[PDB]
Amino acid sequence: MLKIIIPTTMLLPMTWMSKHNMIWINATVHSLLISLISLSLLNQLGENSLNFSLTFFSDSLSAPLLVLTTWLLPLMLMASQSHLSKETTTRKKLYITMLILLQLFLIMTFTATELILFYILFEATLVPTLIIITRWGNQTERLNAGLYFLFYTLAGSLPLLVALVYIQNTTGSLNFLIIHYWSHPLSNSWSNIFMWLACIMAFMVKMPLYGLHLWLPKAHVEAPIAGSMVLAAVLLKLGGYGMMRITTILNPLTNYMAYPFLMLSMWGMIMTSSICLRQTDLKSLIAYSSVSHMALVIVAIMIQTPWSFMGATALMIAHGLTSSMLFCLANTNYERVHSRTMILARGLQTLLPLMATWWLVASLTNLALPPSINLIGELFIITASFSWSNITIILMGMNMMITALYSLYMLITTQRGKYTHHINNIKPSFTRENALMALHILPLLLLTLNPKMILGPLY
Amino acid sequence: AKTLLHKYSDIPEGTECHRKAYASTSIGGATGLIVSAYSIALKPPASFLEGVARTGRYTFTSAAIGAIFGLTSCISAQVREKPDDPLNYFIGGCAGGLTLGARTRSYGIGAAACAYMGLTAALVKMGQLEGWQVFAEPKV
Amino acid sequence: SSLLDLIWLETILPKTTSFIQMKMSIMVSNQKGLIKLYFLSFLITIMISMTLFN
Amino acid sequence: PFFDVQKRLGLDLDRWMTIQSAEQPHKIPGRCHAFEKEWIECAHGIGGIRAEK
Amino acid sequence: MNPIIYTTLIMTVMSGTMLVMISSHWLLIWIGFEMNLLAMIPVLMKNFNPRATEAATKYFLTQATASMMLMMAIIINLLYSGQWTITKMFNPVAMTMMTMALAMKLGLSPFHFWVPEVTQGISLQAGLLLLTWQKLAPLSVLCQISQSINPNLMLTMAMLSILIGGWGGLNQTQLRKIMAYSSIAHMGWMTAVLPYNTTMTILNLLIYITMTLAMFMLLIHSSATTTLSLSHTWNKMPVITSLMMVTLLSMGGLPPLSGFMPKWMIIQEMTKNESIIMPTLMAMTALLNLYFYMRLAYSSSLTMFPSTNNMKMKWQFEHTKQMKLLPTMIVLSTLVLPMTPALSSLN
Amino acid sequence: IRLQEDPDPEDENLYEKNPDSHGYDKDPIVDLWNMRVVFFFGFSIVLVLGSTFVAYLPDYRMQEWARREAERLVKYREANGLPLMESNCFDPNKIQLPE
Amino acid sequence: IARTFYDGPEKNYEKTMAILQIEAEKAELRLKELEVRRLMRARGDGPWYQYPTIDKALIDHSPKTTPDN
Amino acid sequence: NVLQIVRDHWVHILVPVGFVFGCYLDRRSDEKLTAFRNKSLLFKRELRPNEEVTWK
Amino acid sequence: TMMSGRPGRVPLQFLPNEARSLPPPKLTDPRLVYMGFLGYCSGLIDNAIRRRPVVSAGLHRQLLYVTSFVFFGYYLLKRQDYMYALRDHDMFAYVKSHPEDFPEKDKKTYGEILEEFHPVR
Ligand SMILES: CCCCCCCCCCCCCCCCCC(=O)OC[C@H](COP(=O)([O-])OCC(O)COP(=O)([O-])OC[C@@H](COC(=O)CCCCCCCCCCCCCCCCC)OC(=O)CCCCCCCCCCCCCCCCC)OC(=O)CCCCCCCCCCCCCCCCC
Ligand SMILES: CCCCCCCCCCCCCCCCC[C@@H](O)O[C@H](CO[C@H](O)CCCCCCCCCCCCCCC)COP(=O)(O)OCC[N+](C)(C)C
């Protein structure tokens, strides 16, 4: 993994040593090169993982997440250079430094082979994100959003640290391979119940579980565009990766403890879709859609079958790409009219046709349209839930109907109708924005062409 | 303190509800006396009668909470015939929280106290059952 | 949106916790800085430690 | 915490005054010199835990 | 105060602490405490004003009471054993008196009020010396006598310290009182781990001292004593605000900064001894400290507060005095997490 | 007014100074080269080369190996009249059950 | 692609064997260290937890004023 | 002139040399895990006449 | 205090004589490189605080920072390695000396061990 880790730590000095007008060019080009290099991790095995060294290893679950992280960095650079034109050179370099640090922490998080090093990195991702939000956000509420995000995550994750050190004392090791090979059943006792709670609650807060989700609209609405892109596409997936990894040691207690979380996930999936139906803000609509999809992923992990894990992996990758694209589209609209209200700017199809096409494609992927990987993951989760019980189909069908309703509602409201008459500053779409949307959407369809690359280790 | 806790724990779980209520009332009264002593020291009253009134109010609130908790927990255990069940302690804790809310004349304080005291009391029962220790003896 | 997300889920965990912490902070920090008061507190602490700790 | 400069440098700053079985002026014995000597000799070199047991 | 008299008083404070640390006799330990207090009072009163006089009076009263209780404990121990050597104490009552006296010296709750009061009373340099050195000595004594410490009393005072520090810091808006409540909380952590691993106590002491030195020296450099005074520093020297923000993040215990190492090691060590409820409560309560550190970080670096018109003249001029080892303290307090296993060298 | 504050600046339009702008930079040459490097590297290199590389990744997941092994097993077992799928994963002789 | 970029399965297989052996040995050593610490602290008969006692070289063995010491 | 281009574009070798250094460190990490090389039950074989190790 | 008061411990000795029999750290140790990195970061922060050009000014001062950090890190690593070797030595000796407390247990195969099966459905 060092062939990918070191070039990022070299992005840092290159960013600080490049000229004042070449920072964006250098950062974008070399981020793309590092993404290309990280594409080599997809050549996985059918039996075991890629054990690079004592510290880092890669799997069919880690590799797509690393590729998504490395691919997301240059897109964030493009959106950032859109909205950070008037900044000073030092502050531009500080923003790029925060993005690079976040990418480095995420890479080491997905490739860390110990639960304690994984904990350290997955908690280290909080600082750059908090700085980005509370420093380069636009509105007053960025401070409160940062407080909510930070304290929700830490309240979730501190009992996880206690549980991890306890498990290390009990079993002698926190290495994932050793805890997989030496796993023992978790007896039904109050102590085991609270160990299970510590671990799962950390990752449920990070996911987020319905009822532990308010920090998500607060932070995703109030963050800058790069912050929104990384919060939804990658940072939400630390919870899924952690829950998939740590449930090795939590059986058979997961069979009995998953009822409250499954009930919360299914009902809150319905509730957040219904909220999306009646949102006066576009960014909040996209955030609540993210909550619904992560609820589906939580259901998949909790029911915990080989078909549900594949659907969970596929849905995580697909949601990352789709939500990042939706945030970028909303941000272009905001940079036009300087407001997040959904009904302020209308007729954007007759003012900007190609952006209307991008909106159509992003909203067609947001709802599960076959054969997109969004649908593939959702359908695998639905099938596993059907095997779990036969009323999960009722809840899942209701969720799919509401998802289609609010996605097409967003499309029709923003793009169709008649343009607002007094908004006379809708300049033609930039090549940069068009290329950003294309770079979001083409990999999704190529992943549809080759779907075994994102179905996880259980494939 | 240790003697009072030893008496309360030496009374068996599902039996002698009057003695359980007496022991819990004594513990609550002691806690209220300590709280009232610290309150008098740190926020002095305007008069001796005001000090006595505040001490009595705090002591009676704590004693009532203790009596309600002990009585409710023991009665619930007796009627359900299920000793060593955290639900009995949860019911006692929420009853104590409702008593605190009644003493403070506040529905919100009552509800929050019911929730928190129920969780705390259920956790204490689980700790007694499982062998949890707060002030662990040094080893290793 | 309103009753659950904006009102009750907000009241249960983050609003109630913040209110409790603010109240306890006010209680702790609301001192007049009187050595008489907090030395009487020291005396109570010493008596409690001598008696209730064995 | 404890920097044994006395042991390191061979100094004697208060070890003379630590015990009453040590060297006293005019060889005046302590009240419990024999008992203290016996206890010190028993407890020498086995540590606090074994010395107390 | 004459510079020669000031440096001889500083040397006398240090000599008293060193006598405490190197002595093997309880009388010599008491003498060291007395010498430290006697030379420490004028340092607090160095800049004469009523607040400094009041702070020195309160500090003297508290420390004299603590020394008296300590000598009573020493004499009671001598009565029941005839031993002057500092080892395990042979009387539980003497041990309780000693624990109370050392806790009163350190500022552990419920003996904490003098800490915020005196720290707000005295200047920034005096507060720096107070917190650092005057925590350095009693903790060494406690580490020496750790094997007889009552775990219940020690852990009760530690949890009280953590809770009180968090809440007081939440309320405060003055920088020196914020530092004092942070100090109370950190002392709580150290003494919580004390009955299990004095090595972890020493590690927490060193990390706390480094972070406190960096923070106090940044305040001295920026000449800021309130929140609003510190809100003007972004318009004079924006580097100092950024370093202070990183140091505040480190103090709050966020990974991968150096403030995470002591909390991590203490949680692990206490878990080895089958303590779970105590480490979990301690870890959750530190969120209060993190909250008021973050509140301080919003005002100074992450947001730009209004400035004044004479800041232009301040721009025209340059800072003259150079803080000694400020860059080293900044780096050690933020970037030494990958060097954690050196605590064995500390052992 | 409570402060001496700047008025809110008017939004800056990149097409006014540079009609054929790509939205990357104020400078025309830097803007053009930013567009060029983004398009070339991203689209050409990453998209085309990574897609073809992933398409022709070697079969290390052993799909075709498993298929050939299954064909050999089926051929052997149906030639000899053995059941195609063995009833037990492990050898009951090696397994020792409690009394 | 397999020739230029990747290696044979034997390398990863046997590297995993080495890594697993190291990690298993470390887990065994950690558990054994915990057991040893527990025993040494409980009994005080090893090199660890040797709290100091008073030196017997300080005792004065010369005759005193009184015969019975 | 030519010097200015090198004076300006010397930062474009940092990420490539980082990739090369990372590959080198990966090889170094591999060469310390060679305790079961040609010793697994599944892959143990005889050495070829002109080879010293099975893998590097 | 676990290893404080271990027999034969000379007070105030950073590195005893018995530590000379251990392999000294290689000068290219990653921990030594990280100590040098800390020194370099301190030098940059010094330039930034004093308002000198961060990367250019004070090359001699930055060299002194890096050299001091590498020096102290080398000696610190030696002491850390010595303490860990001492801990392992003591643990092994105690296990050897207390066989009744650390007994060798007969190894049973998974064909003989019976484990409860918990289906996931
Ligand atoms: C190496 C590259 C960096 C990597 C970083 C990785 C971590 C390292 C940590 C320590 C780094 C060393 C210390 C640097 C201090 C710099 C201070 C400064 O003045 O910076 C600006 C300075 C230039 O500006 P200036 O002319 O001084 O004007 C300053 C005025 O303020 C300009 O006026 P203005 O008003 O426009 O400026 C205002 C600005 C001025 O404010 C600043 O400049 C302050 C910058 C941050 C303070 C230092 C924090 C140190 C603590 C550790 C964490 C650092 C992370 C960020 C590092 C930023 C590095 C600049 O403040 C703000 O805008 C406020 C923003 C507040 C939020 C952001 C600040 C906090 C960020 C850090 C917290 C997050 C940490 C996350 C946890 C993980 C940590 C790893 O930048 C530099 O000199 C760049 C330094 C690095 C140069 C390259 C070195 C390597 C050369 C090639 C090596 C090749 C090796 C061999 C390869 C093989 C092939 C041959
Ligand atoms: C010019 C080159 C650079 C020099 C810079 C110098 C800066 C550091 C100054 C040196 C400090 C150490 C002094 C070395 C000589 C003194 C010898 C003696 O003090 O060493 C031992 C003791 O030394 C110290 O205790 C340990 C020194 C190591 C401390 C620094 C590392 C702290 C760990 C931090 C880990 C994370 C940060 C990593 C470093 C960046 C003696 O043991 P002992 O007398 O019986 O202790 C009795 C008390 N006990 C038993 C309770 C401990």
Q: Concatenated DSSP letters for A240-266? A: HHHHHHHTTSSTTHHHHHTHHHHHHHH
User: Measured from the CA of A9, which atom of ligand 1 is nearest?
Assistant: 4
- For the Cβ of A132 lying below 6 angstroms from any atom of ligand 1, the answer is no
Find where tokens 């015939």 sit.
Answer: B81
- Resolution (angstroms) stands at 2.9
Q: Is E269 on the interface with C (CB under 8 A)?
A: no
**Interface with B, mutate which of C13, C39, C41 (most B CBs under 10 A):** C41
The helix/strand/coil state of G48 is: coil
With CA atoms as reference, the chain H residue closest to G19 would be H33
If you measure CA to CA, which chain H residue comes closest to G14? Answer: H36
Task: Tell me how far the alpha carbon of residue I32 lies from the centroid of ligand 1, in angstroms.
Answer: 22
Check if A75 has its Cβ closer than 6 Å to any atom of ligand 1.
no
Asked whether the beta carbons of residue C1 and residue A278 sit closer than 8 angstroms, the reply is yes
Q: What angle do CA A438, A443, A445 make, to 5 degrees?
A: 100
Say if the Cβ atoms of G28 and A172 lie within 8 Å: yes
Residues of D in contact with E88 (CB under 8 A): 48, 52
Structure tokens at I35: 């100590």
User: Do the Cβ atoms of G43 and D24 come within 8 Å?
Assistant: no
| CA F4/CA A319 separation, integer angstroms | 47
Q: Label residues E170-193 b or e (16+ Cβ within 10 Å = b).
A: bbbeebbbbbbbbbbbbbbbbbbb
In angstroms, the CA E285 to CA A199 distance is: 19
Q: For residue E254, which residues of chain A lie inside 8 Å, CB to CB?
A: 123-124, 126-127
CA I9 to ligand 2: nearest atom: 45
User: What is the position in ligand 1's atom list of the atom closest to the CA of A10?
Assistant: 97
Q: Which residues touch A308 (CB under 8 Å, ≥6 apart)?
A: A299, A300, A301, A380, A381, A384, A385
Round to whole Å and give the CA distance between A69 and A41. 13
Question: For chain B, how many helices (H) and strands (E)?
Answer: 5, 0
Mutation for testing the E interface, residue in B134, B137, B139 having most E CBs under 10 Å: B134
Structure tokens of F69?
């092994």
Q: What are phi and psi of E174, to 5 degrees?
A: -95, 140
C-beta of I84 in contact with ligand 2 (< 6 A): no
Chain C residues inside the 8 Å CB shell of B44: 37
Contact between chains at G28 and A53 (C-beta distance less than 8 A): no
CA distances from I74 to A147, I71, I85 (A): 41, 5, 17
β-partners of residue A114 are A175
The residue count of chain I comes to: 121
CB E336 within 8 A of CB E258: yes
User: G7 and chain A: CB distance < 8 Å anywhere?
Assistant: no
CB contact under 8 A, C48 and B34: yes
- Closest Cβ opposite residue I91 in set G32, G50, G51: G32
Alpha-carbon distance of G69 to H2, in angstroms, equals 98
Tell me if A12 CB under 6 Å of ligand 1.
Answer: yes
Q: Which two tokens stand for residue D19?
A: 């015990």
For residues C12-41, one letter each, b for 16 or more C-beta atoms within 10 angstroms of the residue's C-beta and e for the rest, the string is eebebeeeebeebbeebbebeeebebbbbb
CB pairs under 8 A between A and F: 93
Residue type (1 letter), B15: T
Query: Are A218 and A144 a contacting pair, CB within 8 Å?
Result: yes
CB contact (8 A) between residue A425 and residue F21: no
What are the phi and psi torsion angles at F54 (to 5°)? -65, -35
How far is the CA of A451 from the CAs of A205, A263, A374, A420, D14, in angstroms? 29, 30, 11, 42, 80
Alpha-carbon distance values, A433 to A33, A271, A352, A361, F19 (Å): 21, 33, 12, 15, 16
Closest CA to E129 of E7, E290, E293: E7
Tokens coding E238: 């924006």
Give the separation between CA E210 and CA E236, rounded to whole angstroms. 25
Residue whose CA is closest, atom 50 of ligand 2?
A: I4
Total length of chain G:
69
| Best residue among E237, E242, E250, E337 to mutate for probing ligand 1, ranked by most atoms within 8 Å of CB | E242
Query: Is there a contact between F58 and G9 if contact means CB atoms under 8 Å apart?
Result: no
Do C and D make contact via 3 or more CB pairs under 8 A? The reply is: no
Burial-class residue E165 by CB neighbours within 10 Å (0-12, 13-18, 19+): buried
Nearest CA in chain G to F60: G9
d(CA F1, CA F17): 35
**Residues E171, E116: Cα–Cα separation, whole Å:** 12
CB E277 within 8 Å of CB E208: no
> Which residues of A fall within a CB distance of 8 Å from F50?
36, 39
Alpha carbon nearest to ligand 1 atom 91, residue: A13
> Measured from the CA of H14, which atom of ligand 1 is nearest?
99
Q: Report the C-alpha gap between A45 and H42 in whole angstroms.
A: 16
Nearest chain A residue to C1 by CA distance is A275
DSSP assignment letter at E226: B
- Closest alpha carbon to E319 in E230, E243, E226, E218: E218
Report the alpha-carbon distance of residue B57 to residue A164 in Å, rounded.
Answer: 45
Give the span between the Cα atoms of H45 and I9, in whole angstroms: 52
Distance A97 CA to ligand 1 centre (A): 8
Q: How far apart are CA E254 and CA C25, in angstroms?
A: 23
State the sign of the Cα–Cα–Cα–Cα dihedral E84, E90, E92, E93: negative
**Angstrom distance (rounded) from CA A427 to CA D17:** 92
CA E57, E61, E62, E63: dihedral to nearest 10 degrees?
Answer: 100
Count CB pairs under 8 A between chains A and G: 44
Q: How many CB atoms lie within 10 A of CB A166?
A: 20
Long-range contacts of E125-130 (CB under 8 A, 24+ apart): E125/E220, E126/E43, E126/E44, E126/E46, E127/E176, E127/E179, E127/E180, E127/E216, E128/E212, E128/E213, E128/E216, E128/E217, E128/E220, E129/E10, E129/E13, E129/E43, E130/E40, E130/E44
CA of G33 to the centre of ligand 2 (A): 25
Q: What are phi and psi of B129, to 5 degrees?
A: -70, -45
Q: How far is C11 from chain A (nearest CA, A)?
A: 11
Mutate which of A16, A20, A101, A102 for ligand 1? The one with the most ligand atoms within 8 Å of its CB, which is: A16
Technique employed here was cryo-EM
